[PDB]
Structures are given as structure tokens and as C-alpha cells.
Design brief:
calciotropic hormones; parathyroid hormone; Parathyroid hormone/parathyroid hormone-related peptide receptor; mainly alpha; monomeric; hormone receptor; 31 residues
């Protein structure tokens, strides 16, 4: 309940993983 409520208000995680090039290139650079 409480974990799902803040994720449904700001839906940013689903939009950045839709753009697959600009997400795994950002994580691989900071290692």
C-alpha cells in the first residue's frame, strides 16, 4: 500500500527504463 502510493504519484522509473540506451550507459559509467 504505502510503497506503491509514492511510485504512482511520480512515475519516473517506467519512463527512464522505456529509453533503454540512456539508463544502462549511465549505470555502467559510475562503477
Amino acid at each position: 500500500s504505502e510503497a506503491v502510493k509514492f511510485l504512482t504519484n511520480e512515475t519516473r522509473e517506467r519512463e527512464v527504463f522505456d529509453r533503454l540506451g540512456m539508463i544502462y550507459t549511465v549505470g555502467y559509467s559510475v562503477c
